[PDB]
Amino acid sequence: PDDRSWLEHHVVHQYWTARPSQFPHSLHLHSNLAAVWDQHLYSSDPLYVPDDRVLVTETQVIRETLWLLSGVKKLFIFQLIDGKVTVRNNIIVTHLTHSCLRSVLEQIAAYGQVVFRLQEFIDEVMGPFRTYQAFMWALYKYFISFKEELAEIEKCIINTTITLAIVVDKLAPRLSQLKVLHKVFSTGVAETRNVVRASHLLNTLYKAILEYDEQTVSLLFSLWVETVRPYLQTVDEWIVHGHLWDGAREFIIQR
């Protein structure tokens, strides 16, 4: 008592854990739909097959999708099965018939896998080379801005109509570019030496800029600068200091 009651009032904590869930609400078919269809089915004699699910609430799905897309990993909604994030279907919203839910979270999960893989790569750097390191640095530089916007949206779900289709639509011209990066980098991560494994990546970069040469061009440019930055430094050094110094034969011109 007295902390438990304080909890029960101003805190919810019952839908991302194994507790019964309710939400105070005013049903009447347009938002009771899933239960309406369930009762229709049960009257229709399926035969039975119970629909025991824990009932998730609505706005908090929107908290989960902002968190997944922003860059942090491992949520309640959106679990992994082999290391690739996918929708869980053990939760039910009062409406949507539980089939639209699987689709909408599947497409958002398709974005979430893209950010999941990149954040996995960047986390496995902090637990010579200087190019992949120089590329994850540029990727992180884009990532902090991308995360800031989605976090800024997340604050107003504490501070306003709440629906799925607006918060995805507001992020459409970022989630478009997010898919492009997943194809540009995947061909620059294919493949031994630290100079071959940099060369196919950089050549992929210079080739993929000319394809789009909107907004995506500036996105690939901001990554281009921060990977050619080591090379130009050692080139300048080779000019004025005369000798070529690039340790472990990182320079593509054999000295």
Partner: peptide
């Protein structure tokens, strides 16, 4: 440098 050349970069800057």
């Amino acid at each position: 440098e050349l970069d800057d």
